[PDB]
Amino acid sequence: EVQLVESGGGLVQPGGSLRLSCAASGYVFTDYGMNWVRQAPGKGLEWMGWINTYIGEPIYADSVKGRFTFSLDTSKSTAYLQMNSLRAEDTAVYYCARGYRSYAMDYWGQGTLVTVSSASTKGPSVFPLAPSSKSTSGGTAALGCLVKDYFPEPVTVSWNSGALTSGVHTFPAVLQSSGLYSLSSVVTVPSSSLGTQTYICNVNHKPSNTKVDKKVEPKS
Amino acid sequence: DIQMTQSPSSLSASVGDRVTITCKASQNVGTNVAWYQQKPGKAPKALIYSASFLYSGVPYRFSGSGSGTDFTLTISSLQPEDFATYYCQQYNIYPLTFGQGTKVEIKRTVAAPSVFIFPPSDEQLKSGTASVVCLLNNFYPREAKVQWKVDNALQSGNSQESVTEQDSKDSTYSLSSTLTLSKADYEKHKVYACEVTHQGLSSPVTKSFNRGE
């Protein structure tokens, strides 16, 4: 199947540059061009330009012409977006999207978040949200992980290395007055499983290279 | 540039409803219009090209119509998984431009939240801070009020809320409210209480604990 995988995003200082990569598979890379589109948090989609993948000729939206540039490595079936002299306003999710010149975009990459900030990266602390000792016998219990004080977004959270997906809610992060993010991830399970089934939240904060497995159990 | 204007900005409809959203172009764009579906945290998915043709794999309940300046997207029988923001886009001429999107929410029967409260862990307390978490799970509609009291003192300004996006299967929401205090402050008080008000509750539900018990 057609797949577009973006990387190279993350934290960058104001005035700095990043070079995003969009690695394509599952089709002949040079049979379609590539678009770049961005989406600032909570806002709409903004087309930045298109590149001819057969000869490497780029077309830019006037808004980013000169400051952003497109390039290729056909031998790697990869398109790049170098974004320069960045400012806070450039903070956004950046997508590559396959397509012909002046046409619809039929496949999109997963998107990569670029955060333009002078603040330093910070990995999360992970604390248990321990299931209540008053959980209903034969009933349902809630437990979770508090993933606190990290920067920038994003963090990923899974449970039991992905074996546990049913009943999971990983909340949108909230920016604290400290300038750091925090979220909880919770899951509901049978009360009867508490103390028997192991529950581990797997937290990965790539910008700080912080991976934590936190076991959550009833408190004694 | 060509401006694309979508209406309404958001709509709510029940499972099985037929739903139509509109997109107006500021200039003639022929039928050079596409529609995309974007679910929370995901990349847009292409639904429709040349105003009315479905991409392969797209469910038949999606359709599109129009030419010139007036375009529509229709869902013939809304499903819970159709919760998304829908975007139109013209490619009559560069630069490609998008509408601001229409957020489609699923209307369903009222569902009361299940409420849970979590004291701070001893681990966190060692770092000098206490977070107290109140969880409202799987409720509808989204409107809910959470009130924090510490030894009967109303807490204002030291909590933050986060709400999940509507669930793609049961169309409910969940919500966390997190109260933050210093370790010193936490240890000066006994009763920590979260009071929840919601349409599905005949009267407010309070979950509470006494510190150390």
Author numbering:
A (entry chain H): 1 to 220
B (entry chain L): 1 to 213
Please give sentences taken from the publication describing this entry.
Among them, TNFα is a major inflammatory cytokine with a crucial role in the pathogenesis of inflammatory autoimmune diseases via interactions with its cognate receptors, TNFR1 and TNFR2. TNFα is a trimeric transmembrane protein; it can be cleaved to release a soluble trimer. Certolizumab pegol has a unique structure compared to those of the other approved therapeutic antibodies against TNFα. It is a monovalent Fab fragment of a humanized anti-TNFα antibody and lacks the Fc region.
The crystal structure of the uncomplexed certolizumab Fab fragment was also determined and refined to a resolution of 1.95 Å with R/RFree = 0.147/0.179. The certolizumab Fab presented a canonical immunoglobulin fold and four intramolecular disulfide bonds in the structures of both its uncomplexed form and its TNFα-bound form, as expected. Additionally, all CDRs of the structure of the uncomplexed certolizumab Fab fragment had the same conformation as those of this antibody in complex with TNFα, implying that this antibody drug maintains the CDRs in productive binding conformations prior to interactions with TNFα, thereby contributing to the high binding affinity to TNFα. The elbow angle of the certolizumab Fab fragment, defined as the angle subtended by the two pseudo-dyad axes relating the variable and constant domains of the Fab fragment, did not differ between the TNFα-bound and the free certolizumab, despite the intrinsic flexibility of the Fab elbow.
